[PDB]
Write a protein that binds this ligand. Structure first.
Ligand SMILES: *[C@@H]1O[C@H](CO[C@@H]2O[C@@H](C)[C@@H](O)[C@@H](O)[C@@H]2O)[C@@H](O[C@@H]2O[C@H](CO)[C@@H](O[C@@H]3O[C@H](CO[C@H]4O[C@H](CO)[C@@H](O)[C@H](O)[C@@H]4O)[C@@H](O)[C@H](O)[C@@H]3O)[C@H](O)[C@H]2NC(C)=O)[C@H](O)[C@H]1NC(C)=O
Ligand SMILES: *[C@@H]1O[C@H](CO)[C@@H](O)[C@H](O)[C@H]1NC(C)=O
Lengths: 233, 189
């Protein structure tokens, strides 16, 4: 009932960014916050009803618009690296805040470093299988920038959550390169069955359609990149 | 200068332990004070709302207090679960005047009754000579080493739950020489 779009965005310094919030709660109040480590959430702009907006605590460099009860937009007319953050919108009736899912925004100096991950699936050790009757598969995503990614595991075409541990934050490998790892652990019997299909998927959020890409190499658009393995006896 | 401060800033506690989070503020008006929980990459979830000059609330394993004279609040989590791992925010005031504290990062770690620490080398079949080390099934107090070498990387402990629990860390390197034995300096390589 509170939906933000886009959920991820890469912008260049000096560019324009608009984040939209659409609510179905029929709440009179709406809010735009950003979240930054050491600051919790800080209110940028808010609105007490359709047709008007109010400056929050840190409004500088942002504008807002409330054209209807349902919609509350945050506008960055001239993006700066300082605006790199996670943005949350919320609606409110009677004091309680109902938050959107969050938007990751990266404002970069140029788009040339944006790059999708290389995804590798490392197969279980035979020693682990022999000694513990368990099989840990490890997925490694390397070489990506910025860090707008989601890693998920798919077993037999269905997303799995039990037996999975993913790094909660991507590791900066070098100045313009991140990595992320994850493990899926299954029983030896499950790994040993030829019917079973295992796939690690990384959703990389990158450039959109309107973005200029002046290279011979592939445009780093939003895309899923995966690696897979089949069970074996 | 921030008007809402929280303690502890961070803490790592063993599963089943109780913990107490604290908040104090200098903000006026303070008609309401609320505690929110935020999980890794998630939105915020309201845990309790305190309103009276001296107030006390109960919500399952959560209990909270408010002393508006001292401008002080506490949130008590009884018998922590691994799923309590999150950031807890104190939020003072209402609507456009509400102010968030910087949060308390809580991590809850399990008791491993029978650790069987082992280091395994795994191979990527799509890349010749590409391998990685998996350190697994070690106890919760064990320190996972940070990289002291260029081109080598080691992850932070990640707690996995099969639905038993296992601690794990991963390491990889682009160095011809170094193997799994010298990376994880515990046992069973
Ligand atoms: C959050 O709360 C802390 C702790 O303050 C206490 O708790 C709150 C709820 C109230 O009940 C307070 O009355 C309690 O004191 C606040 O920090 C304190 O702030 C006050 C000012 O409001 C400070 O009082 C000053 O202290 C000066 C001397 O300080 C030095 O010596 C003491 C020795 O005890 C030492 O503790 C301190 O570190 C200094 O080195 C004094 O000259 C001055 O006149 C005044 O009395 C008090 O020192 C602070 N306590 C601490 C431990 O630092 C926060 O300000 C509050 N935050 C918010 C946002 O409200
Ligand atoms: C990647 O996969 C997700 C979940 O499986 C899917 O919903 C999404 O549309 C995919 N992304 C792209 C850009 O294809």
């Amino acid at each position: 009932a509170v939906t933000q779009s886009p959920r991820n965005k890469v912008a260049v310094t000096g560019g324009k960014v608009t984040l939209s919030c659409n609510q179905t709660n029929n709440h009179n109040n709406m809010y735009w916050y950003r979240q930054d480590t050491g600051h919790g959430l800080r209110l940028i702009h808010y609105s007490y009803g359709a047709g008007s907006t109010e400056k929050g605590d840190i409004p500088d460099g942002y504008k807002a618009s409330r054209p209807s009860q349902e919609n509350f937009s945050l506008i960055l007319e001239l993006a700066t690296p300082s605006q790199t953050s996670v943005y949350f919108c919320a609606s409110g009736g009677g004091g309680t805040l109902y938050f959107g899912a969050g938007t990751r925004l990266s404002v970069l100096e140029d788009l040339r470093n944006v790059t999708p991950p290389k995804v590798s699936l490392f197969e279980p050790s035979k020693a682990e299988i022999a000694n513990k009757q368990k099989a840990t598969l490890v997925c490694l995503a390397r070489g990506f920038f910025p860090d707008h990614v989601e890693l998920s595991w798919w077993v037999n075409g269905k997303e799995v959550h039990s037996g999975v541990c993913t790094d909660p934050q991507a590791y900066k490998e070098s100045n313009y390169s991140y990595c992320l790892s994850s493990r899926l652990r299954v029983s030896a019997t499950f790994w040993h069955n030829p019917r079973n299909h295992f796939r690690c998927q990384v959703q990389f959020h990158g450039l959109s359609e309107e973005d200029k890409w002046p290279e011979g190499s592939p445009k780093p658009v939003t895309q899923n990149i995966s690696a897979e393995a089949w069970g074996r006896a | 200068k921030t008007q809402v401060e929280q303690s502890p800033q961070s803490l790592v506690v063993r599963q089943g332990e109780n913990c107490v989070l604290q908040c104090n503020y200098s903000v006026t008006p303070d008609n309401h004070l609320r505690w929110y929980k935020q999980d890794t990459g998630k939105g915020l979830v309201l845990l309790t709302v305190l309103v009276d000059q001296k107030d006390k609330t109960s919500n399952g394993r959560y209990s909270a207090t408010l002393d508006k004279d001292a401008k002080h609040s506490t949130l008590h989590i009884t018998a922590t679960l691994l799923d309590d791992t999150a950031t807890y925010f104190c939020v003072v005031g209402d609507r456009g005047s509400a102010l968030f504290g910087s949060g308390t990062q809580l991590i809850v770690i399990p008791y491993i009754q029978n650790p069987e620490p082992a280091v395994y080398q795994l191979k990527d079949p799509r890349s010749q000579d590409s391998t990685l080390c998996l350190f697994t099934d070690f106890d919760s107090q064990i320190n996972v080493p940070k990289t002291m070498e260029s081109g080598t990387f080691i992850t932070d402990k990640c707690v996995l739950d099969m639905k038993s629990k296992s601690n794990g860390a991963i390491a990889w390197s682009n160095q011809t020489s170094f193997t799994c034995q010298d990376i994880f300096k515990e046992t069973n390589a």
